[PDB]
């Protein structure tokens with residue numbers, strides 16, 4: 001399969017990314033609490049549904065929510081302001097709440113069953129989001145030998161996500177509060193602006209009724 005790209009909604013962020021986030025890849029966005037990582041996650045869940053001429057892949061999206069950050073009303077607002085039908089945008093985004101890190105790891109196996117079901121239909125899964133991927137791993141693995149166990153567990157989780165990305169031609173997008181194909185550092189700036197830098201030029205964008213934009 002040819003590498004597809006999903007537009008982030010910001011032309012500036014898209015140019016930094018080579019046209020958007022790639023399928024058969026894991027893109028990780030990291031930053032401090034309140035930098036806009038979840039906003040980007042929400043905008044991509046809408047953008048993936050658009051035709052390629054509009055920056056999408058005619059795809060559906062899976063959203064693994066670890067900290068209760070999924071807002072369907074936000075997807076609706078983003079869809080309405082991008083000239084999409086809000087009810088239809090919601091019907092193409094499936095959300096699952098991860099209750100702890102072990103549950104989060106099992107949800108990746110369940111995502112594979114949903115990907116298989118939709119494979120070769122008119123709306124195949126083209127995006128899998130894991131919001132605050134490390135949140136549960138950081139709060140649960142405190143102690144002596146807990147740190148080596150945290151590392152073994154995340155390594156296995158990340159390898160399961162890499163496997164899905166390549167096998168089913170999906171863009172995996174993960175957020176992390178301070179392994180990936182691409183790492184993007186996100187920070188707040190002056191005048192409510194958000195700044196993105198590739199880790200290993202800078203994009204500048206705003207958080208608006210259109211999700212994220214120039």
Ligand SMILES: O=C(O)c1ccc2c(c1)CCCC2
Pocket residue numbers: 062063064094095096107108110111114
């Ligand atoms: O509703 C469910 O049973 C369910 C289970 C797993 C996953 C989703 C939904 C959506 C995101 C991917 C992981």
